[PDB]
């Protein structure tokens, strides 16, 4: 009565992350079918993340007042049905695809908010962590499976349409099994404190920078590689390679960071922000070489992106430790939620659209040729290393005030207790 619940919720989260990136792996086709440009090409992901951002806290609230199995089943059926129906739109409408992405966002946010509470409450203190970790290992695997599934099905059938109709039916299955196996189970005063905690603010802004980089690159890079292979007169394995890389890199970073922490925690007490800052600057150094390696040899570009992906995801498992190191316990429920909201408001909400806008504004004042389309996208994407470097300085800035923050925190907890 527990293992079945764990397995079914895990597969649910894998489907959740598999049905976000099926747009990207077929992006090149949509732009031609509907007669839109890049400025409209980024709007899909921008609207998706905006809907998710506005949705998640409301279902977080309602999850404590009505039953939760019902909400999970309703949400999974909702986004399955909407994503199945969206694939039948004709060539003269685009706002319908935009609205489709919004609704899929609502459903996905529902599931992602309410699953962890159940998978945590059905276990005790000592074993909660292992199954929570197994639950969270669904992120990179589904992320890669997105590109792989989209490219494989689109190539196999011969039309991009069925790229959005193979996934939902599998969801249609799960929507019933959760109704079979899993058993039923003053914030304002906090704000005036959290914005006076320097490490908290700087860590939040740094995570925002990381989110900007991740969203922009993850949406756009495959199209850039396609344009590169075209201009060099060498040319869709492109979407597959990338996927594979992700499915590995997310693990390595999450290991290496952790390891490098347990050493530096024994030589000083500023370990975590220093490790994160060093890794981030290294990531910037290697990322800024893709845009020069792609014009000579493609394998060099792939090696560069591999090292960048490894070093960029290192700080995934450290920011939580900082947050619980510098905040009193009875605020953590607040201090977490806010951060996630902010992490989306300055990050993936407006990144792909901004990249597309810059690219189109560059191209409108030059001749229309494959070469200049290449140069437009390549010059536009140069902002990612800039923001990575800025985030690195933000981690140094929090490494300065770390100790004083901890001292204040201990004084507060003892005074209250």
């Amino acid at each position, epitope marked *: 009565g527990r293992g079945a619940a764990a397995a079914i919720l895990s597969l649910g989260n894998v489907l959740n992350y598999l049905d976000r990136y099926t747009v990207a792996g077929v992006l090149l086709d949509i732009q031609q079918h509907f007669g839109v440009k890049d400025r409209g090409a980024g709007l899909l992901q921008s609207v998706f993340i905006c809907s998710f951002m506005v949705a998640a806290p409301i279902f977080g609230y309602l999850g404590d007042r009505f039953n939760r199995k019902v909400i999970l089943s309703c949400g999974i059926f909702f986004w399955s049905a909407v994503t199945f129906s969206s694939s039948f739109i004709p060539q003269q409408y685009f706002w319908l695809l935009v609205l489709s992405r919004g609704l899929v966002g609502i459903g996905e946010a529902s599931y992602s908010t309410i699953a962890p509470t159940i998978i945590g409450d059905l276990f005790t*203190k*000592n074993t909660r962590t292992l199954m929570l970790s197994v639950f969270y290992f669904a992120i990179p695997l589904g992320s890669g499976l997105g590109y792989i599934t989209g490219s494989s099905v689109k190539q196999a059938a011969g039309d991009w349409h069925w790229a959005l109709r193979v996934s939902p039916v599998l969801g249609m299955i799960t929507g019933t099994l959760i109704l079979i196996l899993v058993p039923a189970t003053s914030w304002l005063r906090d704000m005036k404190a959290l914005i006076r905690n320097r490490s908290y603010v700087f860590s939040s802004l740094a995570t925002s920078a990381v989110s900007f980089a991740t969203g922009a690159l993850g949406m756009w890079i495959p199209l850039y590689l396609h344009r590169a292979q075209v201009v060099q007169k060498t040319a869709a394995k492109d979407s597959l390679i990338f996927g594979a890389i992700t499915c590995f890199t997310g693990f390595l970073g999450v290991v290496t960071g952790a390891g490098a922490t347990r050493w530096c*925690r*024994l*030589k*000083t*007490q500023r*370990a975590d922000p220093l490790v994160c800052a060093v890794g981030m600057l290294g990531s910037a150094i290697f990322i800024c070489l893709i845009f020069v390696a792609a014009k000579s040899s493609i394998v060099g570009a792939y090696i560069c992106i591999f090292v960048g992906e490894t070093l960029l995801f290192s700080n995934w498992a450290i920011t939580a430790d900082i947050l619980m*190191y510098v905040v009193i*316990p009875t605020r953590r429920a607040t201090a977490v939620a806010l951060q996630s909201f902010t992490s989306h408001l300055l990050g993936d909400a407006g990144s792909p659209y901004l990249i597309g806008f810059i690219s189109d504004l560059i191209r409108q004042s030059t001749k229309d040729s494959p070469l200049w389309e290449f140069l437009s996208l390549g010059y536009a994407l140069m902002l990612c290393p800039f923001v990575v470097v800025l985030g690195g300085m933000f981690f140094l800035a929090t490494a300065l005030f770390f*100790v004083s923050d*901890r*001292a204040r*925190a*201990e*004084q507060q*907890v*003892n005074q209250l*207790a």
Partner: nanobody
Amino acid sequence: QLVESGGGLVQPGGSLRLSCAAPGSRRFDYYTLGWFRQAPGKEREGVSCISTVGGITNYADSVKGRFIISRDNAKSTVYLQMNSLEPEDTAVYYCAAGREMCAPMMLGDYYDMDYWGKGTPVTVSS
């Protein structure tokens, strides 16, 4: 790991001092210090904990006014001093290291500590 030293047999009304040290060049100034005890027929209860920066200490209720815990990270040591022992204190003492904050009602959580020692015994005769 850590190394604990001291321990032995005392008469009622005496005093005894134990030490807990980090071998080698390791520092343990992040957060690493608390003392626990276990007896031959009861579960493991916490005795005391001391914090990182400000020298804030917290004790258990049955041992207030009799124990003192002190830290010294110039030589990488922590010390425990006991006065006015009774036949009830015969037990084995442990040194432990974790991340949570020194506060009341956090002594008894011995499932989140990162580093454990091996412990030394104290016996009180009559």
